[PDB]
Amino acid sequence: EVKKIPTMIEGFDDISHGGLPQGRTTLVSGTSGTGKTLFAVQFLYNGITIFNEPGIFVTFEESPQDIIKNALSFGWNLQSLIDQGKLFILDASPDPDDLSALIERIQYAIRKYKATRVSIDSVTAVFSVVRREIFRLAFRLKQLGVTTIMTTERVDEYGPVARFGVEEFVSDNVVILRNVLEGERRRRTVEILKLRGTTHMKGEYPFTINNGINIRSSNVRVSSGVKTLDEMCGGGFFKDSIILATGATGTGKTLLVSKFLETGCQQGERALLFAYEESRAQLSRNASSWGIDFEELERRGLLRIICAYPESAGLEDHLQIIKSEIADFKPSRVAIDSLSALARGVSNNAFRQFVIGVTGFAKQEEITGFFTNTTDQFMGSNSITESHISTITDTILLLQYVEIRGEMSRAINVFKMRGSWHDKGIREYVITEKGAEIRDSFRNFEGIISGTPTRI
Amino acid sequence: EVKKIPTMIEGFDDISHGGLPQGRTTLVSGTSGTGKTLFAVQFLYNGITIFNEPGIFVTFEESPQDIIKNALSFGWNLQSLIDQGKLFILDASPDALIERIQYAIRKYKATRVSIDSVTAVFDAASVVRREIFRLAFRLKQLGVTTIMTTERVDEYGPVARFGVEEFVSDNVVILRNVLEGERRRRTVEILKLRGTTHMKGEYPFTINNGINIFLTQRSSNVRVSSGVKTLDEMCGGGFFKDSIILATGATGTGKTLLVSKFLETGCQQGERALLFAYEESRAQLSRNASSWGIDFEELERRGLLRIICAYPESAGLEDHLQIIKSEIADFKPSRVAIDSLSALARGVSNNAFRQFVIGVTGFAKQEEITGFFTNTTDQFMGSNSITESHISTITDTILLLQYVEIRGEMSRAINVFKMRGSWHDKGIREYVITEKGAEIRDSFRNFEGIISGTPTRI
Amino acid sequence: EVKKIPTMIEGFDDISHGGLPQGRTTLVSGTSGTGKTLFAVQFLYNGITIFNEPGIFVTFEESPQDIIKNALSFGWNLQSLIDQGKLFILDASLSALIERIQYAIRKYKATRVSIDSVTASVVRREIFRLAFRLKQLGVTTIMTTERVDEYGPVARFGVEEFVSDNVVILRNVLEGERRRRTVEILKLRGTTHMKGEYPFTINNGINILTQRSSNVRVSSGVKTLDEMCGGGFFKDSIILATGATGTGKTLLVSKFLETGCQQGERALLFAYEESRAQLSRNASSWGIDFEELERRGLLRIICAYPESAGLEDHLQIIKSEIADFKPSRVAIDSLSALARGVSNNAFRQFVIGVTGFAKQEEITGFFTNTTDQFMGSNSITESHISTITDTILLLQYVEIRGEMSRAINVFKMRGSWHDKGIREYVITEKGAEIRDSFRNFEGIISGTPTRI
Numbered sequence A: 001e002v003k004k005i006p007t008m009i010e011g012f013d014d015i016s017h018g019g020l021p022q023g024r025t026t027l028v029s030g031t032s033g034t035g036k037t038l039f040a041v042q043f044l045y046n047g048i049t050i051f052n053e054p055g056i057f058v059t060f061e062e063s064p065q066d067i068i069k070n071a072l073s074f075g076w077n078l079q080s081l082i083d084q085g086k087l088f089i090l091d092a093s094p095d096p097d098d099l100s101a102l103i104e105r106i107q108y109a110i111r112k113y114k115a116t117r118v119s120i121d122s123v124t125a126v127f128s129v130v131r132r133e134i135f136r137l138a139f140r141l142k143q144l145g146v147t148t149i150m151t152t153e154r155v156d157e158y159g160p161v162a163r164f165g166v167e168e169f170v171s172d173n174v175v176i177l178r179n180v181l182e183g184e185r186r187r188r189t190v191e192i193l194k195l196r197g198t199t200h201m202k203g204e205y206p207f208t209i210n211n212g213i214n215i216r217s218s219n220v221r222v223s224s225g226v227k228t229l230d231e232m233c234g235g236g237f238f239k240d241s242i243i244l245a246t247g248a249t250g251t252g253k254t255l256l257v258s259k260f261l262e263t264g265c266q267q268g269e270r271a272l273l274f275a276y277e278e279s280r281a282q283l284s285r286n287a288s289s290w291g292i293d294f295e296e297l298e299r300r301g302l303l304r305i306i307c308a309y310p311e312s313a314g315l316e317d318h319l320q321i322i323k324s325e326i327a328d329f330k331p332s333r334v335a336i337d338s339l340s341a342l343a344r345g346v347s348n349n350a351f352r353q354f355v356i357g358v359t360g361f362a363k364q365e366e367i368t369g370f371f372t373n374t375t376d377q378f379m380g381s382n383s384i385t386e387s388h389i390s391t392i393t394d395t396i397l398l399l400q401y402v403e404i405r406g407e408m409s410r411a412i413n414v415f416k417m418r419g420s421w422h423d424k425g426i427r428e429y430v431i432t433e434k435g436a437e438i439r440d441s442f443r444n445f446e447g448i449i450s451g452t453p454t455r456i
Numbered sequence B: 001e002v003k004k005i006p007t008m009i010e011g012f013d014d015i016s017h018g019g020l021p022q023g024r025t026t027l028v029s030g031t032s033g034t035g036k037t038l039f040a041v042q043f044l045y046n047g048i049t050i051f052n053e054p055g056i057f058v059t060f061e062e063s064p065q066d067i068i069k070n071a072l073s074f075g076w077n078l079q080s081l082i083d084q085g086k087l088f089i090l091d092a093s094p095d096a097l098i099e100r101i102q103y104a105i106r107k108y109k110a111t112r113v114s115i116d117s118v119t120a121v122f123d124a125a126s127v128v129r130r131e132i133f134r135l136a137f138r139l140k141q142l143g144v145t146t147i148m149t150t151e152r153v154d155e156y157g158p159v160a161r162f163g164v165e166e167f168v169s170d171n172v173v174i175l176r177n178v179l180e181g182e183r184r185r186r187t188v189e190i191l192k193l194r195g196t197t198h199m200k201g202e203y204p205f206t207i208n209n210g211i212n213i214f215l216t217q218r219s220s221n222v223r224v225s226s227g228v229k230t231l232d233e234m235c236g237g238g239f240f241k242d243s244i245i246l247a248t249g250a251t252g253t254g255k256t257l258l259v260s261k262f263l264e265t266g267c268q269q270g271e272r273a274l275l276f277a278y279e280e281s282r283a284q285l286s287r288n289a290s291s292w293g294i295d296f297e298e299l300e301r302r303g304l305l306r307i308i309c310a311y312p313e314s315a316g317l318e319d320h321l322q323i324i325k326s327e328i329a330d331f332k333p334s335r336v337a338i339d340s341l342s343a344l345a346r347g348v349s350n351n352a353f354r355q356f357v358i359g360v361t362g363f364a365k366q367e368e369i370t371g372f373f374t375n376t377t378d379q380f381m382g383s384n385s386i387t388e389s390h391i392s393t394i395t396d397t398i399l400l401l402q403y404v405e406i407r408g409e410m411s412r413a414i415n416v417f418k419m420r421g422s423w424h425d426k427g428i429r430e431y432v433i434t435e436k437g438a439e440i441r442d443s444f445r446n447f448e449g450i451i452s453g454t455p456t457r458i
Numbered sequence C: 001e002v003k004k005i006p007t008m009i010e011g012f013d014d015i016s017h018g019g020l021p022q023g024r025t026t027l028v029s030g031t032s033g034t035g036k037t038l039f040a041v042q043f044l045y046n047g048i049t050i051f052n053e054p055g056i057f058v059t060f061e062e063s064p065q066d067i068i069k070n071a072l073s074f075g076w077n078l079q080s081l082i083d084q085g086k087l088f089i090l091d092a093s094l095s096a097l098i099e100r101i102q103y104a105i106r107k108y109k110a111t112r113v114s115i116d117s118v119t120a121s122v123v124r125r126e127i128f129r130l131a132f133r134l135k136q137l138g139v140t141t142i143m144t145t146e147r148v149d150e151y152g153p154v155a156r157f158g159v160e161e162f163v164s165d166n167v168v169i170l171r172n173v174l175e176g177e178r179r180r181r182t183v184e185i186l187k188l189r190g191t192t193h194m195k196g197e198y199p200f201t202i203n204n205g206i207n208i209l210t211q212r213s214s215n216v217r218v219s220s221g222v223k224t225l226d227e228m229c230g231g232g233f234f235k236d237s238i239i240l241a242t243g244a245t246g247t248g249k250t251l252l253v254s255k256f257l258e259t260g261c262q263q264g265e266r267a268l269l270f271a272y273e274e275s276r277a278q279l280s281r282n283a284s285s286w287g288i289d290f291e292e293l294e295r296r297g298l299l300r301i302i303c304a305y306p307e308s309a310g311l312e313d314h315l316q317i318i319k320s321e322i323a324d325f326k327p328s329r330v331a332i333d334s335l336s337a338l339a340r341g342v343s344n345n346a347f348r349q350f351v352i353g354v355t356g357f358a359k360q361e362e363i364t365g366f367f368t369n370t371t372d373q374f375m376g377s378n379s380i381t382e383s384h385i386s387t388i389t390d391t392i393l394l395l396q397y398v399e400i401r402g403e404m405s406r407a408i409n410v411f412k413m414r415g416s417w418h419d420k421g422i423r424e425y426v427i428t429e430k431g432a433e434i435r436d437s438f439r440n441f442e443g444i445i446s447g448t449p450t451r452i
């Protein structure tokens, strides 16, 4: 089969099923600021630092000094690698005031530094004539047995692969970087279009730029901090579960999240809250009016609240920020209030990808996850979520209003509990200064789940 | 690693995380009338006035005197800066240039340069590429920070003109002027900053005090009155001073009456109240309000009440938001009302509407101003939704007004549906409208299906 | 009359009704990485290995060493065929080229020729001159051409397709963020062919309603359900278990897999919602040891995320797992996870494809569907696949005296009597215990009944 070398770019070696085909050129194509120079630098940097494989970077516009200065923001010390004879940056930029000769310089540098990896950025800038030129360069690098990245420009996100509609047909390997405007938000994706003679995953995969390009179960029980709800769940929530609290505006979801967080903290565990609707001040005032002291928990270093606006960032960026804070603070409990705030004005496919990411990540770290969903219908709603994420969750707590004798009551139901028995009751509950008080089912009523029951 | 210098353009140093990379070119591209020359002038003006950094402005078309005259509409006095040798405008217009720019950078000790516009010179895409590279390289050599402005024909087509400029520059900024139905919406995007961080995608802005690009709020237990005794008891002692109140229900239920009481009660405590009315004139508002003994005309001429009447269709949402922000800043209300959010929502995208609501509500809470917003529902009975715009979760207290068919007549009932941080009455209370205003009575304890609008007596 | 020579590329000879017109040029057009070189190579490889017909491969860019090394990934040993003088790779990396092609054809007595690729007004006469010379020599020719677009010009210059007697378009289409491979036979002058696009995958080269039906019964693994279905599921059937989140679809899957393995039969599960760990834990609550059944080699579970591959590629994985493991029983948990954010037409082709493969292999299929509406649903599935299935189990929530109860109906049962009851069931430690219908209620199917 066709042998591959690891890029060690995070997630890339998975989508390429091993890395880039050894001894061949890969075209990396994309619009301006897609991450082309980034991929090309990371390739050489990882080659040297992880595999002691020397590298040539050929630039046709940017100055060596600018390549080195840019890489500093990632903590990559390119100058050190130059001083060790591991990295050579070959300046092929034009005069501030041909072809055969360039191919000869690159060969001298390859043999002198004993380089196995080469990046060229960008061959677009040194330009049927284009076709034969990429072919000649690619031919000589193959003969010398190096693995090459050639970056190309493009103007349109979903039009031609490169610029002259020829490059991709010459290259054995084609990677496309995209930066797609989804409404007013940008979404970064990598695609492996083609790898001759070998396998790769197909279509677009999300990625972020942070630190370079970035593409188990148990019977253990854990408390909600509501005594009666623990009973209703069969002895409590599972430690390795995703919990969904869903229902109409004002029902009591933020109350249930408050109790979840506080309970982990009084067991001396850390809890992490991502709030997308309310400020820290308001969360704390409301919480104090339920008998919960978020301020004391915060002082003791047990509770961290991250407040952010959904429409401030793209979903992939929200997920990266979530992964970073978990890796840093190392919680045993994570809460999202609300998933429905993050779903507003985004494709359901983008949102479902986000939800699969957050929940996958929580279940890998064996973190207990509590997520809220506010329904659009305040009554008579025949669905758990409008985003159809039900099948991604282990436990579902249905909160709903019920008209009783001319007043708006409210009931709680453990709708789903994978792995355990649960109470089937639609149990009336009351909110007070002590938080949630759960009472009995409405025995002598029909049509409770409609919101407008009838006395039997 | 890459250091930035402050632009002090309102909101830009936030999306750039500190401003523009020092010692490099930033491309600012846009269609005609997007704010490019404005951005270029403001970079130099703020450099001089705020950090004593001198600047060169290169024009290839516009006269110096027209650049100076145009800045005076923002109260920027460029001539005094030119008198002091802190600003120099280089006329490169029709009846090499690198030579002249470098002479001026030395002579004025300039650390900031604006070139407006680099398109007007440019023929071959290879010609423009090599030309923009040489200019950028010579300016970087001198150690100055540059903005080069560029033209485009399309809002979502090429970054620039020859599909090459954006690849040469270290830094690209796109100013857009999008037609959304018949309304224009200005946005700014940092596409790329080599070697550093930036916020991604488009941010709304307006042009008022130059370019103006626009969850850490306070929260108290302080109560304020609604002007309706029984409603204050239903809300557990009053509205919260730090809250957003939504009054929602079908046409004619009594939302505007509840706004009139909210505002009247503030003035009665000698506080300023501010009303934005998108459906009715001052004269109609005043006549209807006098039905309850409220004299809006006396409250206006004594400077306690200010009523702003406008049609939603007369401006884009971002410009409505600008008028609300500056009216709150001038008049300094304790209470602000919008009548109605439903009026502003029609024939605009849900995404742009929710952006507007986050913005007005977020700014009211920031300044600890009590906000009261109305929403008229499209279904006058049997509605299973609070709003069709789904803004419920952005509001703290929700008042639901509804019609209820009783004995072949249309009665109305009021419910405190939601009250963050307090107990509230759960009753669906019948009310009647008379000269006393809203008279709230008992819930209908003998009926089922009240919330459907067509009850059944048991 | 036009005669065809067989390609023996899986599925090509059916859509072409025999193969490629003999003695003529077929144009194979596509964007980059559509399978053009793969097609041109397979044509020659299949000719030499199956029909002993010598071939010439003419390359204008790729080196012979690359073509040979690339073909090794499928275990096609092109070197041994070159060493036997059955294959010649002509390196052209126009009058002069035709000379060497003629000489080669004569020297090797070749009937098949691939030219890859001819892209590397004047083109029209060039392609015509080339196609003409090969027609006089009696060879059947593949000519590969490059496109810029998926639904734009057939080739590059807007003439190649008008000169060729036969045109084939390979597409690699972006549907949301997933790629879908299709082959279309646009035209074959002087003969018949199937019309429009046909799905394919690259697995062993290019891979592009008449089954048996017995009265043999198999157990659901739940006694009462076997009686409700009139003595068990049919061996030759597709079972759809459909209903709201948490009704017990996965429990029914676990029973159906277990009872198979406990008879010494192999079962295969495709899981798209839950990990092996969560599946095993939940299953061990009802006394099922998936790990043990796997250990004994009677169970195999495949866990994947829907969003990870396209549906053509999921269907390929399912077909190769069945071919390898040879199950009596197969489960998909769930079809609703696969339907999310793909087109309904794409989803339906996937369903017809997987049900057709189970049915022609005599494999009992058990698929789950979760309904979006948890109560009062007027439909079996939102995707409307009911008519592709033989047995339908409807699981639904029923409000009884302020509590959420559960009911099961055998809704359809092609070929057999079935119970008409909407029967209450409870999930306990013993699994699913099915009880009686609510005979004193009205509107049970609404989920909010009234006591009569």
Ligand SMILES: Nc1ncnc2c1ncn2[C@@H]1O[C@H](COP(=O)(O)OP(=O)(O)OP(=O)(O)O)[C@@H](O)[C@H]1O
Pocket (backbone or CB within 6 Å): A030, A031, A032, A033, A034, A035, A036, A037, A038, A039, A073, A074, A153, A209, A210, A211, B166, B167, B168, B191, B192, B193, B194, B195, B196, B197, B198
């Ligand atoms: N330290 C950093 N942290 C976060 N993001 C960064 C960092 N450094 C760079 N970036 C991001 O990476 C981008 C630079 O990508 P890169 O230089 O690879 O672009 P490119 O594809 O080569 O563009 P062009 O074709 O214009 O040269 C910046 O636009 C920025 O968004």
Ligand SMILES: Nc1ncnc2c1ncn2[C@@H]1O[C@H](COP(=O)(O)OP(=O)(O)OP(=O)(O)O)[C@@H](O)[C@H]1O
Pocket (backbone or CB within 6 Å): A248, A249, A250, A251, A252, A253, A254, A255, A256, A289, A290, A374, A431, A432, A433, B392, B393, B417, B418, B419, B420, B421, B422, B423, B424
């Ligand atoms: N001190 C209190 N006494 C009684 N009830 C209270 C008290 N404080 C809050 N509540 C109740 O809690 C409700 C708010 O609960 P919570 O914030 O958890 O709702 P939610 O479902 O998160 O709503 P949303 O997300 O739509 O804002 C109030 O509307 C009120 O009914």
Ligand SMILES: Nc1ncnc2c1ncn2[C@@H]1O[C@H](COP(=O)(O)OP(=O)(O)OP(=O)(O)O)[C@@H](O)[C@H]1O
Pocket (backbone or CB within 6 Å): B030, B031, B032, B033, B034, B035, B036, B037, B038, B039, B073, B074, B151, B207, B208
């Ligand atoms: N004093 C002012 N108050 C409010 N808006 C103003 C004021 N002065 C200018 N503007 C707005 O700014 C616009 C001009 O911005 P600017 O001159 O930067 O455009 P530009 O992008 O440079 O256009 P062109 O490419 O045609 O030169 C005016 O069309 C007007 O809408």
Ligand SMILES: Nc1ncnc2c1ncn2[C@@H]1O[C@H](COP(=O)(O)OP(=O)(O)OP(=O)(O)O)[C@@H](O)[C@H]1O
Pocket (backbone or CB within 6 Å): B250, B251, B252, B253, B254, B255, B256, B257, B258, B279, B291, B376, B433, B434, B435
């Ligand atoms: N003098 C009055 N006496 C009694 N009822 C009155 C009087 N004036 C107005 N009303 C009642 O108040 C209603 C108007 O109240 P208001 O303007 O607040 O309604 P609204 O919900 O804001 O209406 P819209 O949907 O048109 O904006 C009338 O339809 C009527 O029922």
Ligand SMILES: Nc1ncnc2c1ncn2[C@@H]1O[C@H](COP(=O)(O)OP(=O)(O)OP(=O)(O)O)[C@@H](O)[C@H]1O
Pocket (backbone or CB within 6 Å): A168, A169, A170, A193, A194, A195, A196, A197, A198, A199, A200, C030, C031, C032, C033, C034, C035, C036, C037, C038, C039, C073, C074, C146, C202, C203
């Ligand atoms: N052994 C293999 N197993 C699986 N997939 C493979 C294998 N070898 C090749 N592929 C797939 O086939 C593709 C190669 O197709 P092919 O070489 O025919 O492309 P093409 O249409 O000729 O493109 P171009 O015109 O750029 O040369 C790769 O992109 C990869 O997706």
Ligand SMILES: Nc1ncnc2c1ncn2[C@@H]1O[C@H](COP(=O)(O)OP(=O)(O)OP(=O)(O)O)[C@@H](O)[C@H]1O
Pocket (backbone or CB within 6 Å): A390, A391, A393, A415, A416, A417, A418, A419, A420, A421, A422, C244, C245, C246, C247, C248, C249, C250, C251, C252, C273, C285, C370, C427, C428, C429
């Ligand atoms: N040990 C147990 N004892 C009693 N009931 C249990 C037990 N374990 C699970 N359950 C019940 O079984 C349900 C889970 O069944 P199952 O996982 O098959 O549902 P599903 O229809 O596949 O759900 P989903 O929609 O999540 O795929 C729980 O919600 C609960 O009602």
Ligand SMILES: Nc1ncnc2c1ncn2[C@@H]1O[C@H](COP(=O)(O)OP(=O)(O)OP(=O)(O)O)[C@@H](O)[C@H]1O
Pocket (backbone or CB within 6 Å): C386, C387, C389, C411, C412, C413, C414, C415, C416, C417, C418
């Ligand atoms: N031997 C039998 N005894 C009793 N009922 C039977 C028997 N065979 C079939 N049935 C009944 O006939 C039904 C199938 O009838 P038929 O296939 O004609 O339905 P259909 O409406 O065409 O269904 P589809 O939607 O699948 O096309 C079974 O669900 C069952 O009710």
Ligand SMILES: [Mg+2]
Pocket (backbone or CB within 6 Å): A036, A037, A038
């Ligand atoms: Mg670059």
Ligand SMILES: [Mg+2]
Pocket (backbone or CB within 6 Å): A253, A254, A255, A277, A337
């Ligand atoms: Mg909440």
Ligand SMILES: [Mg+2]
Pocket (backbone or CB within 6 Å): B036, B037, B038
């Ligand atoms: Mg201008």
Ligand SMILES: [Mg+2]
Pocket (backbone or CB within 6 Å): B255, B256, B339
């Ligand atoms: Mg009104």
Ligand SMILES: [Mg+2]
Pocket (backbone or CB within 6 Å): C036, C037, C038
């Ligand atoms: Mg090829």
Ligand SMILES: [Mg+2]
Pocket (backbone or CB within 6 Å): C249, C250, C251, C333
């Ligand atoms: Mg399941």
